Amino acid sequence: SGFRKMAFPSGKVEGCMVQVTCGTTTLNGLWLDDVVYCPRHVICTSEDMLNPNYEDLLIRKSNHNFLVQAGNVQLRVIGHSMQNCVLKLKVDTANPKTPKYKFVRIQPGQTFSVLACYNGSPSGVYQCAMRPNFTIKGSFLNGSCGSVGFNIDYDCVSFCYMHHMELPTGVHAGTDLEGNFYGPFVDRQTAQAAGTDTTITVNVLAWLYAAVINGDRWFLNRFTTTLNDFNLVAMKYNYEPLTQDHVDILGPLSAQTGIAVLDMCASLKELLQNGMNGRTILGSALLEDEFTPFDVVRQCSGVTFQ
Amino acid sequence: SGFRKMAFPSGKVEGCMVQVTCGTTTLNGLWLDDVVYCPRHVICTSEDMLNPNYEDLLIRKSNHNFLVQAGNVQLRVIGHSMQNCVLKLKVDTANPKTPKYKFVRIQPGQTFSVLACYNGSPSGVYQCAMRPNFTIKGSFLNGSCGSVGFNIDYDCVSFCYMHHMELPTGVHAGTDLEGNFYGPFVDRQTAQAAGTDTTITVNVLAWLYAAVINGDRWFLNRFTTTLNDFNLVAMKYNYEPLTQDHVDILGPLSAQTGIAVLDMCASLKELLQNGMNGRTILGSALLEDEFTPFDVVRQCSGVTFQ
Numbered sequence A, B: 001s002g003f004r005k006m007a008f009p010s011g012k013v014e015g016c017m018v019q020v021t022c023g024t025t026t027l028n029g030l031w032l033d034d035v036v037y038c039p040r041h042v043i044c045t046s047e048d049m050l051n052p053n054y055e056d057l058l059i060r061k062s063n064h065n066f067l068v069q070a071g072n073v074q075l076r077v078i079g080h081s082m083q084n085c086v087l088k089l090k091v092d093t094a095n096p097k098t099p100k101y102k103f104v105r106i107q108p109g110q111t112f113s114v115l116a117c118y119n120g121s122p123s124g125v126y127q128c129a130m131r132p133n134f135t136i137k138g139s140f141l142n143g144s145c146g147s148v149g150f151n152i153d154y155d156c157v158s159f160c161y162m163h164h165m166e167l168p169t170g171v172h173a174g175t176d177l178e179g180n181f182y183g184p185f186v187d188r189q190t191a192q193a194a195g196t197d198t199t200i201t202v203n204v205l206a207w208l209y210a211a212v213i214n215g216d217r218w219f220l221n222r223f224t225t226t227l228n229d230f231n232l233v234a235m236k237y238n239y240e241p242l243t244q245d246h247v248d249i250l251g252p253l254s255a256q257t258g259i260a261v262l263d264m265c266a267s268l269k270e271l272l273q274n275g276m277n278g279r280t281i282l283g284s285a286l287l288e289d290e291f292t293p294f295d296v297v298r299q300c301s302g303v304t305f306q
């Protein structure tokens, strides 16, 4: 037993990280088959960032201006193109370590693993949620740009995130691997509206189910509620509305524990209204919302990967 | 910026995990050079566990009773020996993926990465501390036994933990890779004393330094204290005594922030006495104690690995 914020094993993704340099900027690229993907702002000077014209900056660059290094070994760049906010560098060698992969655009409230990298070398691995306002709460220093987020579906790596930039709140924005920003963000260093950071209600419930499965049961009560009554209380606390689809998604957890979703919602309502009275759930004093129902099922049933 | 509980990249360790079966028990082994290490209780029936005589159980077993599988491929066992609470299975093939490695016995308060595995297949990766009472707060289901804990020192993997058993509190006990239990534990299914779980004071301070570096500063105050006065307050809250060695170890963090350790101790004293008044530090409502000063420096300076 026990329940931890757990990342996917990073081996298949470690074999894909390279270093990409353009001028004085060094960051990370993703090497899959004969393409290296990296943030297009690798081409920018610190002045360019304020108001970049990426088409105009990119025109000044040739293949030989993109230095791509795989560990100690230099890769030959035979092509470059911009797709949305990523550069695709065509190299003359297919990555021999390319795993089975796809590019997926994740939904808000879904989780993924980040392999934080610096100079093309993996630093560490952690779990993130795509927040309802399309930010993530990561750990990214200077040099971490081009670090990727992924899920593993048995042997297949689904890449969903590339790291580009930091908001003033210290949260993180980036693109899918087609170079489309999550959320309203643009790769320019100017004031930009981030949404209210709402709590992923369905994830909080999943985690309460995890707690009960792991024998933390103090917050169970004699009460029930309705979707409509729960949602009236939740909206006041900036919780996402709970839907019948969410009830259905929690089915395995309600089935395993014998605790109806609406009864668990009654527990959550009391915890929101009363707080935790200095008590903890799975060693947390806050309601955790970065575990999906799938994450909980997965970790409470224990299925593995390639 | 941002600060997360981050594991080491798991690739070098994923290449070492195998499945080990003896009778009806399947668990995980660690394959390094031509040796597979696994918990000796792989040999036990469910009845044996109550009061096992491992020498007597092991005598009934031959090399051909230990089924060792590396992905789909069977390994030939040419020898077996017991060292303390681990079995060493000699196989006829050196693991071609053996990284540079050592076996280290970690100190209480030190952290490491766990690669949770089932049937020899890596499931996920998370960070643990060796608690002052020589337990860890992991995520381990049936099948997870033989899962290992490690640190990476550039290219060298230091293995420090093998998972064996769960305490009634839901925390975890296991051995170093020489098969010596951390703490007072023995591999028998009988009532066993676990120590009080004290907080790793030096780690809490490291994390407060991380918070200040990441701009969470609300808990800084106008006050200072002394080691002796801090320790009087801490002992009441089951915090480890703070020593001058701990002050010296925080040196890089005090140097980077310009905040004397004793001034940070003054902040911690107020947080212990007053609580957090519903506020959070690095998105936590509790004082985090599973980050070492090295972990904080590492993640706030960003150095990488092989």
Ligand SMILES: *[C@](O)(C(=O)NC1CC1)[C@H](CCCC)NC(=O)[C@@H]1[C@@H]2[C@H](CN1C(=O)[C@@H](NC(=O)NC1(CS(=O)(=O)C(C)(C)C)CCCCC1)C(C)(C)C)C2(C)C
Residues within 6 Å of the ligand: A025, A026, A027, A039, A041, A049, A140, A141, A142, A143, A144, A145, A146, A164, A165, A166, A167, A168, A173, A185, A186, A187, A188, A189, A190, A191, A192, B001
């Ligand atoms: C990344 O490219 C990298 O690792 N570079 C290598 C060379 C070291 C780098 C990572 C920064 C620290 C994690 N990313 C960037 O430099 C991007 C690009 C330039 C500026 N930033 C960036 O992250 C900005 N943040 C930023 O501009 N954010 C906003 C504007 S803002 O923060 O509200 C403010 C107006 C500056 C106050 C714009 C984007 C949407 C969110 C807000 C900082 C360097 C200031 C952290 C690009 C092109 C955005």
Ligand SMILES: *[C@](O)(C(=O)NC1CC1)[C@H](CCCC)NC(=O)[C@@H]1[C@@H]2[C@H](CN1C(=O)[C@@H](NC(=O)NC1(CS(=O)(=O)C(C)(C)C)CCCCC1)C(C)(C)C)C2(C)C
Residues within 6 Å of the ligand: A001, B025, B026, B027, B039, B041, B049, B140, B141, B142, B143, B144, B145, B146, B164, B165, B166, B167, B168, B173, B185, B186, B187, B188, B189, B190, B191, B192
């Ligand atoms: C592990 O071997 C494994 O993954 N096995 C494969 C086949 C599935 C397995 C993991 C268990 C769940 C994580 N480990 C064990 O089975 C060990 C071995 C037998 C029993 N346990 C074990 O973890 C016990 N816990 C246990 O006995 N703990 C105590 C005693 S106790 O919990 O206080 C009590 C008396 C039972 C109430 C003894 C060890 C020190 C801590 C306390 C449980 C199966 C009950 C979880 C071994 C030999 C210890």
Ligand code: NA
Residues within 6 Å of the ligand: A283, A284, A285, A286, B283, B284, B285, B286
């Ligand atoms: Na917390």
